[model samples]
Target: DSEEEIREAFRVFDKDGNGYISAAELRHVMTNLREKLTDEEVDEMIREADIDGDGQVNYEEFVQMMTAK
Candidate 1:
């Protein structure tokens, strides 16, 4: 339904337009949420979403995480 909207959200966080989501970028994202996520928690969060083991999340990985079943 709102899948495209979800993808758009990822693009916003992809700041540098490198097509990959870095842990640093995601850290900012967490901060924007005002949740004050810790460094360890951010690291764990990235690891959980980074399915490719490339140390970052690509578009596919991002989509997968956003639409996880």
Candidate 2:
């Protein structure tokens, strides 16, 4: 429930493997769902889990965003 699960989930395009998720990465995620998320909305979308406020949601704690299932 942890290992490769992290490799999936939001970790897919959520991260460019930069160890974090940013507005740029968040785009493809929404698009994958057939939805186009605006920049502001993308920012707010990550705002919840990306509490860092540095435009990047570190994958470390970022893992908590989707408790590796």
Candidate 3:
């Protein structure tokens, strides 16, 4: 269930056509995240989890990073 749900979540998160994510994209996502995490908070969270400066979260990384908390 986590796998299918995570994939669906990624599809929803990937708002831009670039196939990668940016802070802005994450902001858009967190906006609808029900908990409504703010952009600044999301930025810090991302910075903490991103580890690399790639500016995008692939499906596997995204799921692990997001759910690891």
Candidate 4:
């Protein structure tokens, strides 16, 4: 798939419309489902995805995970 397609996915995850994604913003989405999530769980996801360690997931941060299947 095109990179733009991957970015579109990021846009959705960004939820707050900020240039970056944070664990707090992510938690809000979980309210939409009352599904799997924890404050630390979001932190873990950010740690894995936010390898930059900026404490926020940016466009390039997410692209790092998209190259895989």
Candidate 5:
């Protein structure tokens, strides 16, 4: 996705408007997708994608993961 598209997608997950995607929000979205990931899977996703070590996925981190090859 384009950078703008990535940002918009991130906004959908950032329900609290804090400009970050917490594990809870991630779980919610994933559940909507019908994947039903476990809590450990969500946490692992954050660990892999969260570059800042803040235990969440910020816009930059989300965009990077989407754009990465």
Candidate 6:
């Protein structure tokens, strides 16, 4: 049910499948996560998690961002 939706959603967002999501990824999710996340907040999140300065987020890093406390 939801699993398939998640699987596909990830595939679409992963783009290059480098196991990471870039600013482009955030733009995609932000579009769906809500239409309310302020531009500043999204930018802040990118700055915080984009550890490699590559402007993308890996799967593990994504998991961390989503699940981290």
Worst 10-residue lDDT window for candidate 6 reads 60-69
In model 5, which regions exceed 4 Å deviation?
Answer: 34-36, 67-69
Model 4 gets an lDDT of: 0.69
Per-residue CA lDDT of model 4 for 1-69, tens digit only, reads 577886777666787777787888866764564666778876766677777677876777767643423
The pairs that clash in candidate 1 are: none
**Which candidate has the top score in lDDT?**
1
Residues forming the 10-long window of minimal summed lDDT in candidate 5: 60-69
lDDT of 5 at 60: 74
Pick by lDDT: 2 or 3, better one: 3
Clashing residue pairs in candidate 2 are none
The sequence of per-residue lDDT tens digits that candidate 2 reaches over residues 1-69 is 576666676557654566677776766676776465677766666666665556566656576544422
Error of 1 at 15 (Å): 0.8
lDDT of 5 by residue, 1-69 (tens): 576787677667778998888778888887776575798887777777777777877777887644543
Ordered by lDDT, highest first, the candidates read: 1, 5, 3, 4, 6, 2
> Each candidate: RMSD to true structure?
2.2, 4.0, 2.2, 3.3, 2.2, 3.7
- The models' CA-based lDDT, in order, is 0.76, 0.63, 0.70, 0.69, 0.75, 0.66
Local accuracy of candidate 6 as per-residue lDDT tens digits, 21-51 = 6665667768787787766777677777765
Count of backbone clashes, every candidate in sequence: 0, 0, 0, 0, 0, 5
Q: Is candidate 3 or candidate 4 better by TM-score?
A: 3
**Candidate 1 local accuracy as lDDT?**
0.76
Model 1: CA > 4 A from native: 67-69
Could you give candidate 1's per-residue lDDT for residues 2-56 as a string of tens digits?
A: 6687578876788998888877887887787758578887777777777877798
User: Can you give the lDDT of residue 56 in candidate 4?
Assistant: 78
Q: Give model 2 RMSD, 1 decimal.
A: 4.0
| Cα deviation of 28, candidate 6, in Å | 1.7
The CA lDDT at 36 in model 6 is 72
